[PDB]
Amino acid sequence: ASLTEIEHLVQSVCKSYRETCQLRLEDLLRQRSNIFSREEVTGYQRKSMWEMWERCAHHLTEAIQYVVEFAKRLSGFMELCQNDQIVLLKAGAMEVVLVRMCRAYNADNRTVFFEGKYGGMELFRALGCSELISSIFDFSHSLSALHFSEDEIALYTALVLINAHRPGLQEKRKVEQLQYNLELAFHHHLCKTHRQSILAKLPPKGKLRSLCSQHVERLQIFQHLHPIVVQ
């Protein structure tokens, strides 16, 4: 490994992200003025918890499909064994979705893009998950204050996936090497772009894991009762 390799890694991660980012940031930004009316919000608040679960499931499986397309474009990732790829995605794909959410979050009015328009947390009322919804909003809010560039999101979410602390990895050392190369690529790119100051503002160690845990615990509860997810 060396610095020209590290530069090509940055270019390459950031390219995979652009190809798998789901919606272009500029599309998400321009859609900010498209907000659910009070009548639309009400129509959402009236759905059963089951219908909202269906809609959130569909929303998430579609976000996860881009994250899997992202991983599969990653340099080091396809060279990892079949088991390690599965262990990393199972543990990290939802964490990556939680990070990616900040692009579709508008801090000025605390709304998120969901099914074609922006709406506030109250849109999700019928779920009966207001503690967890409001943690997810807070997490998005605090990432949103960093004003992440696409390439920064690209590198940070790559680091979210390639984490050698996942239990059940068989080639731990190989995942370690790719993790440390990504961490170094991230630092390097921050220096190139005079953005070192964001390292201190990243979510503390374990805030993401624990939020994702609580998120998935709740999905598993809806799933055991209305199994809408397949595989």
Ligand X SMILES: Cn1cc(C2CCN(C(=O)C3CCCCC3)CC2)c2cc(NC(=O)c3cc(C#N)ccn3)ccc21
Residue (of 117, 145, 121) closest to 133 by Cα position: 121
Q: In angstroms, give the least distance from the CB of 166 to ligand X.
A: 22
Q: Which is nearer to ligand X, 126 or 202 (CB)?
A: 126
Q: Which is nearer to ligand X, 128 or 168 (CB)?
A: 128
Q: In angstroms, give the least distance from the CB of 6 to ligand X.
A: 27
The sheet with strand 105-106 has its strands ordered as 105-106, 111-114, 117-119
Q: Which is nearer to ligand X, 155 or 169 (CB)?
A: 155
- Kindly list the residues in this chain that would bind ligand X in the complex (CB under 6 A): 22-23, 28, 56, 59-60, 100-101, 104-105, 112-114, 124, 127, 129, 132-133, 136-137, 140, 218-219
Q: Which amino acid is at 61?
A: T
Q: In angstroms, give the least distance from the CB of 147 to ligand X.
A: 16
Q: Which is nearer to ligand X, 114 or 176 (CB)?
A: 114
Q: In angstroms, give the least distance from the CB of 152 to ligand X.
A: 16
∠226-105-35 over CA atoms, to 5°? 85
Q: Which is nearer to ligand X, 146 or 219 (CB)?
A: 219
Q: In angstroms, give the least distance from the CB of 60 to ligand X.
A: 5
Residue (of 143, 167, 165) closest to 156 by Cα position: 143
Q: Which is nearer to ligand X, 51 or 183 (CB)?
A: 51
Strands (E), the chain: 105-106, 111-114, 117-119
Q: In angstroms, give the least distance from the CB of 1 to ligand X.
A: 32
Helix axis angle, 49-73 relative to 82-100, nearest 10°? 120
Residue 129 · residue 218 · CB < 8 Å: yes
Q: Which is nearer to ligand X, 4 or 33 (CB)?
A: 33
Distance CA 81, CA 58 (A): 29
Beta strands at 117-119 and 105-106: parallel, antiparallel or unpaired: unpaired
Residue (of 76, 82, 112) closest to 97 by Cα position: 112
119, β-bridge pairs = 112
Q: In angstroms, give the least distance from the CB of 39 to ligand X.
A: 20
Distance CA 78, CA 119 (A): 38
